[PDB]
Amino acid sequence: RQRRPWEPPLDKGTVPWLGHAMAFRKNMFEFLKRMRTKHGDVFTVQLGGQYFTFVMDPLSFGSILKDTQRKLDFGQYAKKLVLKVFGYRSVQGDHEMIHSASTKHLRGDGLKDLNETMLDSLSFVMLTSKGWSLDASCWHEDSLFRFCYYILFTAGYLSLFGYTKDKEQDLLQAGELFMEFRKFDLLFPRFVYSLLWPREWLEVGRLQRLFHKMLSVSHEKEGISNWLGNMLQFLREQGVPSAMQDKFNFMMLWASQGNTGPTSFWALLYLLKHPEAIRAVREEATQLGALQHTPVLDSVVEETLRLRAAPTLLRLVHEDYTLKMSSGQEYLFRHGDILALFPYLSVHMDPDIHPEPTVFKYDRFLNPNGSRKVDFFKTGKKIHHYTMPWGSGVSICPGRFFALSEVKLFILLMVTHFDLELVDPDTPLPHVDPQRWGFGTMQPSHDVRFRYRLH
Ligand code: HEM
Ligand SMILES: Clc1ccc([C@@H](Cn2ccnc2)OCc2ccsc2Cl)c(Cl)c1
Ligand SMILES: [K+]
C-alpha cells in the first residue's frame, strides 16, 4: 500500500514487516496516545490483515456516527470476529433480528416483565450463596471482582436462558458454568489476537464444546426469555442447524454476561472508596418500578462507565468515504479499510470535557438541583457525545437498558442489605488490565478482598 496525498498519514512502524501489532495489542490505550501526538487526530495502521484508520477528534464523531448515507457498516467486521471466536456464521437478516428482539423484549414492557425475574433471581442467589455460620455477626471475606461477576452472571444467565424445576440445582450449575465462563472470558482478547500458547488453544476448544452442549437447543428448561426464544425462532425458521444454534447461544451468553458483572464490580468498588458517594445512593435507595427514580445511582453508573467502559467503535467502509474535519481538512478512506474510534481517549478522558477525568466523582452527571446534567463542552462547543459506553448509530448496544437494570438492582441490594468494607482500604485501586483495552468494560489488574455481613 502506497499512500495518496488525500489519505491520512500511513505509519508502517520502525521495523516494517512487523507493524504495530505488538505495541497495539500490548497497550492499545498507550499506543493510540503516542500516535495521536505523532500524526495528529487521523492516522492509519495495519493490524491483522486489515488497514485501520483512527479518528481521535471528538468533534468529527458527528457525521461518522450519523452515517447519513450508506457507507459505514459495523456488522461486516463483527461477523468476522464472532466467527473466529464462536464459530457462528452470520445468516442473512440476523443483524436485524437481534435488534428487533431486543427493542421488543429488552425495552419498555418486555424489560419490566424481565426485570421482575432478574430481581427475583438476584435476591435468591445473594441469599442462598451468601455464606453463613452459627454466629450471626460473622464477617465473611471474599474477592470483590469474582463476587460481583458470579452474582450478575448467575442471575443474568438464569433470567435469560431459563430456569428449571429445582431452583437450587439451577444455581449450582450456574456457578459451575460461571467458573468455566470466567476461563473463557480471560483468554478472549488473546484469542481474538491469536496470542495463545498451543495449550491455550486447546482450552479454548474445550470451553467452546462445553458451552455448546450446556446451552444446546436439544438439552427441559422452562420460561426462557422472550429475547432468546424470539431469536431462535428466526434461526430455525431460516434453516439454521441446531449445531449452529448452539454456537449462537454461546455467543449471546458471552455478549449478555461479558460486561454487566465487571461493571458492577467497579461501581461498588468506587462507592466503597468514596464515603461521600455511597451515602447518597444508600439514602436515595431507602426512599417495584422505582428504577426510573434513582438519579443519584444513574449518575454513579454513568461515571463508572465513563471511567471503565473503553470499547472501540469499528466500521468497515464499503464505499470510498470522505471525512471532513472541523479543522478544514478533508480525508479519503478506502473501501475495505476499517474506520475506528476510541471514545475512551477522545471523549472520556479529555480534561476539557471532564475536569479531573481520572477521578471518580459520583455527582459528575448531576445538576446542582439533582436533575440530570447533559450539558458538556470542549472549549465552548457542545459535545453531544460526552459519554460513549454503548456506542451510537444502528449498532448501539441493544441490551444497554437491561444491563443498566442489572447493575442498578445489584448495587441497591448490596448497599441496602449488607455491611461492606474493604480488607485494605489503604491500597490503591487496581488499574485496568491493558490486555483488554477496547473490548468493552475493563477488568482489574488484580482482585481486591472485601468483607461483608448482614445488618
Ligand atoms: C456494561 C455492559 C455492556 C456494555 C459496556 C456494552 C457495550 C457495547 C458496545 C460498545 C457495543 C458496540 C456499539 C457500536 O459498535 O456502536 C455493543 C454492542 C452489542 N451489545 Fe452490548 N454492552 C453491554 C451489555 C450488553 C448486554 C447485557 C447485551 C445482551 C443482553 C448486549 C448485547 C449486545 C449486542 C448483541 C451487540 C451487537 C451490536 C449490534 O447489534 O450490531 N450488550 N455493546
Ligand atoms: Cl455478538 C457481539 C456483540 C458485540 C460485541 C462487542 C462487545 N460486546 C459484547 C457484548 N456487548 C458488547 O464488541 C466490541 C468489540 C471490541 C473489539 S472488537 C469488537 Cl466487535 C461483541 Cl465482541 C460480540
Ligand atoms: K452480529
Every domain of the chain and the residues it spans: 1-455
φ, ψ of residue 130 to 5 degrees: the values are: -60, -50
Compute, in angstroms, the gap from residue 249 CA to the centroid of ligand 1. 15
Contact criterion met (CB below 8 Å) for 335 and 319: yes
The residue assigned the cell 461486516 is 76
**Ligand 1 — pocket residues by CB below 6 A?**
74-75, 95, 98-99, 255-256, 259-260, 263, 309, 311, 313, 389-393, 395-400, 402-403, 440-441
Nearest CA to ligand 2 atom 23: 255
Side-chain-facing half-sphere of 127: CA atoms under 13 Å: 8
Contact criterion met (CB below 8 Å) for 78 and 338: no
Task: Give the number of other CB atoms < 10 A from CB of residue 203.
Answer: 16
Using CA atoms, how far apart are residues 39 and 196, in angstroms rounded to an integer?
Answer: 32
Question: Binding site membership for heme: which residues?
Answer: 397
Coil, strand or helix at 257: helix
Which three three-digit cell numbers place residue 275? 464515603
Coil, strand or helix at 365: coil
Query: Residue 333 gets which letter from DSSP?
Result: E
46 beta partners: 51
Single out the residue of 158, 188, 309 nearest to residue 254, CA to CA.
188
Contact criterion met (CB below 8 Å) for 290 and 305: no
The residue assigned the cell 521495523 is 15
Nearest CA to ligand 1 atom 21: 397
| Ligand 2 pocket check for 110: Cβ under 6 Å | no
Compute, in angstroms, the gap from residue 329 CA to the centroid of ligand 2. 32
Nearest CA to ligand 2 atom 8: 255
The residue assigned the cell 429488552 is 106
Side-chain-facing half-sphere of 175: CA atoms under 13 Å: 13
Burial class (CB in 10 A: 0-12, 13-18, 19+), 55: buried
Q: Which of 25, 260, 397, 401 to mutate for ligand 2's pocket (most ligand atoms within 8 Å of CB)? A: 397
Using CA atoms, how far apart are residues 448 and 202, in angstroms rounded to an integer?
Answer: 30
Contact criterion met (CB below 8 Å) for 227 and 101: yes
Q: Which of 29, 82, 435 to mutate for ligand 2's pocket (most ligand atoms within 8 Å of CB)? A: 82
The residue assigned the cell 444508600 is 282
The angle formed by the CA atoms of residues 69, 70 and 76, to the nearest 5 degrees, is 150
Q: Which of 66, 107, 397 to mutate for ligand 1's pocket (most ligand atoms within 8 Å of CB)? A: 397
Coil, strand or helix at 239: coil
| Ligand 2 pocket check for 82: Cβ under 6 Å | yes
330 beta partners: 324
37 beta partners: none
Chain breaks of the chain after residues with C–N above 2.5 Å: 219, 287
| Ligand 2 pocket check for 78: Cβ under 6 Å | yes
Which residues, 6+ apart, have CB-to-CB distance to 396 below 8 Å?
390
| Ligand 2 pocket check for 261: Cβ under 6 Å | no
Which residues, 6+ apart, have CB-to-CB distance to 388 below 8 Å?
309, 311, 313, 343, 347, 348
Rounded to the nearest 10 degrees, the angle between the axes of helix 198-214 and helix 242-257 is: 100
Task: Give the number of other CB atoms < 10 A from CB of residue 128.
Answer: 13
Query: Residue 8 gets which letter from DSSP?
Result: P
Compute, in angstroms, the gap from residue 452 CA to the centroid of ligand 1. 32
> Which listed ligand is nearest to 397 at the C-alpha?
1
Query: Within its chain, how far is the Cα of 53 from the centroid?
Result: 23
Compute, in angstroms, the gap from residue 398 CA to the centroid of ligand 1. 6
Using CA atoms, how far apart are residues 361 and 57, in angstroms rounded to an integer?
Answer: 25
Contact criterion met (CB below 8 Å) for 342 and 96: no
φ, ψ of residue 140 to 5 degrees: the values are: -125, 120
Long-range contacts of 171-174 (CB under 8 A, 24+ apart): 171/124, 171/125, 171/128, 171/129, 173/214, 174/125
Atom index in ligand 1 nearest the CA of residue 160 equals 30
Burial class (CB in 10 A: 0-12, 13-18, 19+), 135: exposed
How many residues are there in the chain?
Answer: 455
Query: Residue 138 gets which letter from DSSP?
Result: -
Provide the strand spans (E) within 255-380. 309-311, 313-317, 321-324, 330-333, 338-341, 377-378
Nearest CA to ligand 2 atom 13: 439
The angle formed by the CA atoms of residues 213, 214 and 216, to the nearest 5 degrees, is 60
